[PDB]
Design a protein around this ligand. Sequence first.
Ligand code: HEM
Ligand SMILES: CSc1ccc(C(=O)O)cc1
Ligand SMILES: [Cl-]
Length: 393
Amino acid sequence: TIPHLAIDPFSLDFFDDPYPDQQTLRDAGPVVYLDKWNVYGVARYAEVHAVLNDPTTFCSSRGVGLSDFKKEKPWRPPSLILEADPPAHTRPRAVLSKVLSPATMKTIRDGFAAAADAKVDELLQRGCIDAIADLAEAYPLSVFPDAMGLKQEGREHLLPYAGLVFNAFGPPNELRQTAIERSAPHQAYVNEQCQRPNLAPGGFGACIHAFTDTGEITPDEAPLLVRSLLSAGLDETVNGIGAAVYCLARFPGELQRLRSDPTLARNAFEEAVRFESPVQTFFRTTTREVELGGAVIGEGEKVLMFLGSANRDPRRWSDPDLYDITRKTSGHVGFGSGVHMCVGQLVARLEGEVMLSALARKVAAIDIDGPVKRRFNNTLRGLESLPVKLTPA
Ligand code: HEM
Ligand SMILES: CSc1ccc(C(=O)O)cc1
Ligand SMILES: [Cl-]
């Protein structure tokens, strides 16, 4: 009853253009079996949403990559939040929710927005830029390590460690093995920065440690929780901002609408998260035999959720291949859904909003004027190079 497909969603050919294969995966059935890796897959919005919101059947504590922690050893100690189920997940989730809370956003908004305005004005002096290296990457690196409270020494390990984290969710292909091999220097840097003396008071990392006083986490738990904020948040946000810029260049009508009403900046970024879905795919592991979309899945089976395909399912979205900055985006699964739904979403939205606001107020045109290159990652979708010419307003 379940169709078997030979599509490899972790192949360079798939990364290069996944959308025709995503339709094949959606139209083959609500549940497919991927013979290449011996996993189940769901590519439609309805089943992806259902799996995310059924954590007792589709668990995370056996890993959210291909590897099953009950069968293989994790490449690093399991995350206390991402790779945990309720109730172990609850108190670490609560600490990060408070650390990255609405009230926290008030303390960082002025500095984050000033840095975005200054970056755009700097780039307009140059004219022709790489919107990845010089904008999508440069801006988060100028605000988030400071907000974390990291020291200056060693920040060159931050992007390599993030790329490693997301490649390691993948299958044991060249991308994953190349990343894990000789990764000890990146791991050693990150683990050291998670210790309380190395985090600036008032930063995100020091605030996590401050919660050990409360009984929500123990002091021996706090370093691993800090590690989550050195694992997630960087590459996805970079990829999201780069996709937004790409969309505003490829859809010039939408840049003109954003210029006319800069208060659309926050929804313009949300639509880019849907359109690009920086986190493309995530796994769950079944804890029991379960019926999903009329198909029966055994216990202990890996289930691949295609978040990017779910966000482009024409069963759920009108003109899903169109970038539309006034789209009602509520319900997209680019940040997940349910108990694990991105705890850092307010930080991500703040960075993207203030960058798109700066562009909206200062830029009249964005023209691609050089070869565009893709960045390849087992889990993340995003661009490597995006040469554009910025015309001032
Ligand atoms: C556009 C940017 C981002 C995207 C697309 C994204 C995507 C996601 C998704 C899909 C999940 C759900 C994982 C699951 O259900 O297994 C998640 C969770 C998470 N994200 Fe984000 N994220 C982004 C930004 C951030 C930022 C800025 C931070 C930190 C400041 C962050 C930290 C986390 C953490 C710690 C979790 C685990 C939450 C939990 O398990 O309860 N992410 N993210
Ligand atoms: C959903 S991407 C991601 C989220 C959390 C962590 C972590 O907790 O280290 C790593 C990756
Ligand atoms: Cl590590």
